[PDB]
Design a protein around this ligand. Sequence first.
Ligand SMILES: C[C@@H]([C@H](N)C(=O)N[C@H](C(=O)O)[C@H]1O[C@@H](n2ccc(=O)[nH]c2=O)[C@H](O)[C@@H]1O)[C@H](O)c1ccc(O)cn1
Ligand SMILES: C[C@@H]([C@H](N)C(=O)N[C@H](C(=O)O)[C@H]1O[C@@H](n2ccc(=O)[nH]c2=O)[C@H](O)[C@@H]1O)[C@H](O)c1ccc(O)cn1
Lengths: 790, 790
Amino acid sequence: AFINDEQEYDQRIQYNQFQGDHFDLAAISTRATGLNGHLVLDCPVADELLSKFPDYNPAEKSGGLSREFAFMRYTAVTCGPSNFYRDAYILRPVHYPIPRQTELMIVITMYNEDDILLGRTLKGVFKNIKYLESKARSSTWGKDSWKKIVVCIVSDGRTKINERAQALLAGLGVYQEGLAKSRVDDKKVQAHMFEYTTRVGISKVTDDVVKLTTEKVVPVQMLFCLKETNAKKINSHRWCFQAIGQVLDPKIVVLLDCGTQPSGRSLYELWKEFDRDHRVAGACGEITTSLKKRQMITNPLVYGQNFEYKISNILDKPTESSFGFISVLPGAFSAYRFIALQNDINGVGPLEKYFKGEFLHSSGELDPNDDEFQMKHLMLKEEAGIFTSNMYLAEDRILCFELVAKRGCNWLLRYCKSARAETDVPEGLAEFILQRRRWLNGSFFAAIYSLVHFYKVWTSSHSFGRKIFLHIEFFYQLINLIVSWFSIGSYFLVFRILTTSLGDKALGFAPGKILSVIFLWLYLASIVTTFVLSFGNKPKGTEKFYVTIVIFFAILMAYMIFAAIFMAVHSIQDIYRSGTRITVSLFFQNSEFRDLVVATSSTYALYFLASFLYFEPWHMFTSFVQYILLSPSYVNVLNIYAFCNIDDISWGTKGKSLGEAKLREDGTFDVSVPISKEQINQSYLDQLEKIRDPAPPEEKVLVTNTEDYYAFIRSMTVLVWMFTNFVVIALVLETGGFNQFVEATDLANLKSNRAAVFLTVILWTVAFMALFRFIGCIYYLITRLGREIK
Amino acid sequence: AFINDEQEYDQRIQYNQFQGDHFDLAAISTRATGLNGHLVLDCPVADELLSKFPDYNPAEKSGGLSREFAFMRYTAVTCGPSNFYRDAYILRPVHYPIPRQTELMIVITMYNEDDILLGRTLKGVFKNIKYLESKARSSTWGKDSWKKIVVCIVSDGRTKINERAQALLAGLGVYQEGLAKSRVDDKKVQAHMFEYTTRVGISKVTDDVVKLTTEKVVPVQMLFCLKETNAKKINSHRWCFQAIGQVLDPKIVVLLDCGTQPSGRSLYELWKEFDRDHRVAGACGEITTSLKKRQMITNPLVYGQNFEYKISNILDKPTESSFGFISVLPGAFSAYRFIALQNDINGVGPLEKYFKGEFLHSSGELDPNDDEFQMKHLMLKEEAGIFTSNMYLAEDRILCFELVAKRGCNWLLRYCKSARAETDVPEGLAEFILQRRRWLNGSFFAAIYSLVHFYKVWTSSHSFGRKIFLHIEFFYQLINLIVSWFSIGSYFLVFRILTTSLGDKALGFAPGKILSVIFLWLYLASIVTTFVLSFGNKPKGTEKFYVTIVIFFAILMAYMIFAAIFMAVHSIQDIYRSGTRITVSLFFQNSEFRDLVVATSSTYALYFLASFLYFEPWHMFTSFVQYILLSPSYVNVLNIYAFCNIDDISWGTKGKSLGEAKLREDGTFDVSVPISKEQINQSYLDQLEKIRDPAPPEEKVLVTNTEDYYAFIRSMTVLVWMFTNFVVIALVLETGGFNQFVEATDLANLKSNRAAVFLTVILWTVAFMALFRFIGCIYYLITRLGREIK
Ligand SMILES: C[C@@H]([C@H](N)C(=O)N[C@H](C(=O)O)[C@H]1O[C@@H](n2ccc(=O)[nH]c2=O)[C@H](O)[C@@H]1O)[C@H](O)c1ccc(O)cn1
Ligand SMILES: C[C@@H]([C@H](N)C(=O)N[C@H](C(=O)O)[C@H]1O[C@@H](n2ccc(=O)[nH]c2=O)[C@H](O)[C@@H]1O)[C@H](O)c1ccc(O)cn1
């Protein structure tokens, strides 16, 4: 088990002086004393772990180690997040005789994750902490910097945590099996907290095994909170913010997920981003996809996701950062300023909005024995509108808007490209669809909520120009939402127009008509099958149907590109045939050539320039084709599945022995039945009276269950989506009854004109959005360079 | 509580001699002795119930009543249906010193039904038994006929049974609360059986209250089997047939449902049907809908259902009875010959097929403690094909085909119109849809199964002509299935053709085009909304959407009828305009007039004649319009909901405390945690070894859950249905890409020709099916009259 930039860190660190502070222990005889009336145990760690440390001395009973390094502390929490601070639950960092002030709380969320992912995450965090320690000419960082950093691991589900990750945590010395207790004082234990200052560092993380060693390891404060029952990531975040954060009172809370490995200096970059400008309240870093042992042709999906991530980080994040409002901060890797998230005195704030979703989106069955029964009952009893009851879709995204548009605060959201983190993307198609469901739903709901409540930014204390530019960004987001809502209809219209154009006898392509008909039939079949499977079955079961649909859509996209190229070439040849010389004006006057070629080429050129200026050009070659071929799948399959499954009904449906006869030694059976005449007569009369009366009306008027409400909401949403898309399609191609209002000959010309107008509109809208994003990223680069010079 | 044809029965009955036979009791001290090692208690009934009887004498301790009338017997059954006969479970009728042979077992099924429905059913049964007793010149019936009849009530769910119905049963004296025991000898009690010979008769059943009296009441044997947990009607029928039937060994088992009130002589008619011809194995009686306090205009749905039932009983049942094979025997009211249902020595038979559906269609989670674990494990372990695993759809319908096409037996199914029963139809729309789901699914699956396995009738020992006529019936059923599969597409095609015909400028109707377009859009919207609601929501929640859709379809049907009439009138006027005189040949040569008018008029005339010849003409006037207006709803809404919900997933998903710390008198908490160095080191080494190895491949290869299988089956079925219907529609109206293969002018003429051909085909197919059924019912009437003369 035990065996270049990192080397620089080791040189600056002495490694000889790591004596811990003395703290009061809890007596353990096996009666044990608990601090403040709570179940607290300070057990000793395995002797071998102590022996590994260089400072260990065989003569010393404990090796001469400090109290913190020698004993691991276990606490059982029964109250829950809401009352954790109210109760006298004291964490070790604040329990020292000299209080320790936290500067950076690194939160890690785990759920049945393999030991490899946790090992990679912990290796990244340890490397970042080592770099922070090694820093010499820093006012805040340097010697004894590890005392200001706390690593919190919140595992979701005691019975769902992977055994190998638990073994890894035990190897760190944080976790011990025997300590955990199910109940205390007839009260259920909601969470189990283990606190330990580990001096064990992960040397390397291979593909199959994890190797940890004690050589050149900086001490790290570890707090491992194991939850008794899984209550989702929102409940995990409630534990992190509402309960632990208040006790620790840290700044710049960093959120991480298992499998995300930050760089060697990324956390320092995030902290510097927060430190330079005091108005910044949230930050995010570039996220990258690993391509170590994945081939270009064997894994098209991975490379498509890589291209998507690179384009996002290069165009979308910089522009939003320039405007000061980021739609989404990646939960996998982001950071928030703690004070900015605090609610107002009135009780309304970003955290309240974020947490309300967990309470509202759940079965209305509250256990009276829970100590949080009053809070949940009050929250559910309150009248909730459409937006409040549907906050669960937005998730973290709501926090960004709530932070920017505060009543009287001046906060901003910023994106830094210096911070980089590597994560693992889902290789399988079913996992990809399941992941994209929530992304799409959250993005749509967040956009709608922000656009509807855009007036809230007026009261915020921002500069007038800042408000004007925020309004410009809101207008851009409105345009993007409108374009995204009509994605499927626009794709179908473009496909139909391009395929039918090949059917014209003017151009010499014979199989055009038959191919167009076959592709239309296959498209309709794929759409219908996708809808049926989305409503009925689970992605993991019927994966092959989705694979076939994706392959068909890739082939169709290839055919569409070929048709567009053929049409453009034919138009150019006709231009030359017409004679009278050729001029650039004539080329730009031809609708076919212009729309089909110029717009797409301009968009590609903008993407290429943006990639080059960021010194990340490879993704424009290695992973472009896969993304282009998969785009129709992105629009159709993912969007259909996301909209059909808006409601996430995780909870199930709903939720005195008469007697016991025991055979005795003899054949007789011991029974207790009525014997007296009086009681039998009384029972008979009671039955007669019970039946001898008319049936009263029920008039239950029960509130009923919430699952019906969310199912209704999802049904209405999908119906409206279908109706609008079909209205647009009927208007463009005269598909419905509109063809009756025209004649045999006028229909063709009118349809052609409408199709041309639609094509030019959509293509130029896409090109203009690309230009907008390009200019935004250019400005981001210029301003970042100028700030760096300063 | 206690207060003309029936009068005739009382006159013939002496009512003075009703002494019961003596039987051995079980000692009840409160240790009580059980017969054959089972928990059996013979408790005394309430003294007032004994006092009511005329034979009661105040001087006598028990009033002089017989043992059976004085004591009620309770038995606790733990084994279940499979092993009930194997175990020494003895029912009172077979426990007498002189064994009693059962002649007619009247089974009643109850599930949270109101006391009113049970009261009506029991009143009907008691009246039938009284009539049988009164019969004088009968070899089998007459004096002491009540000893040959046993009434079995199987209630589904101990905790779901309605309290008022239970009070009614207690008033009868069958049920007592104290006796029931949850467990015996550490074995769960599956069912609770109460046996009593009640002399209490229901005098009348008002709308709100039930009145029972002891005057002029014939004793009735009652066996009330209350099941501990609900396992559906198939499990109830398993209890009735597999377990009670074997012990009683009756003939002509009669099946009834709560709320079905048979006539005063209906059961005698069924028994006579069985007695006259020994080849008959199953029988059914006419079922009627009550219209006492329901208005023609206030309740259109009730009258539509009334018309449907009358037409069914007048046309469908007689023809199938004439052929000797009935597709469905109403479970609410039918009868079966017990010996015909018995399985073969090899273990294959109608009952095995019927019961296999319950076992296969359920969660694959068998409790090892069940005594039927071996049987269920063997059945599930066996390889099951598509048909065997989907038998749950057919339900009772499978029994009919399994009976007719036996390997070497000669059995027939017959329908008698002398037997009549009145039932309550669902007034609400949601209840109607829920009821029709299973009807449609069962009919479709039974038709498919019978058609596929038509060759099984070859080996049956029937006359050659009988086999020929059965094959003719199979061909007719194949045609009916084909017509029913394409119902929605045919309806849409007819609607589109009729609405577009009004758009032609030849006829002077201006709003035709706009109305056609609007109706097309509304039709598409209704279809899409129906599909979405069927997949997503529950009928009870979103009832108003269905109501609106039904109203729209009724309006559309009215408009379609108007359009057809207008077109026919215009065609006749053009015929007159053409000149050259008029002849019947010219009228029958015009496709428009012929197809639109002659076929529909012929069908209506056939229906009218069939109604008149059966002396039931009123339904052709009172309830015809409602059925005509609701037919499109029948085809669209019910069929869509039934096909979208083929899978009935009733079951849910899926299905050691670390320690306990108790605070003592002092502040210390009592805990048990590791103390010794050795155990801590051993645990640390164990964790190191656990993590120090590579991850082995899972390779679970688990069988997985069955719900996915049924969801997949339903998805495939709906997809195939959609594909076939759309193919037909595209072929007829040139809706898809087919229009590309024609020109501007030829398309209109070709579409018109195809539409005319489709209209004539469909209308004449309907007319010919109506004629076939009419001839069949005519033959049924003639043969029944001839048999009556004989
Ligand atoms: C999605 C993320 C990462 N791949 C991931 O999987 N995140 C999970 C999530 O988003 O839910 C985390 O949630 C935990 N979880 C799961 C189930 C539960 O029930 N409770 C619970 O806490 C999981 O263990 C996991 O750590 C990915 O890197 C990413 C995100 C944003 C982005 O812009 C780019 N990339
Ligand atoms: C449907 C029938 C009657 N209205 C009815 O409701 N039958 C129920 C059924 O068909 O299921 C019976 O099944 C019992 N049941 C219910 C739920 C459960 O979970 N377990 C259980 O035993 C119910 O109590 C009830 O007696 C109607 O008259 C009819 C039938 C056929 C026909 O051609 C014409 N009309």
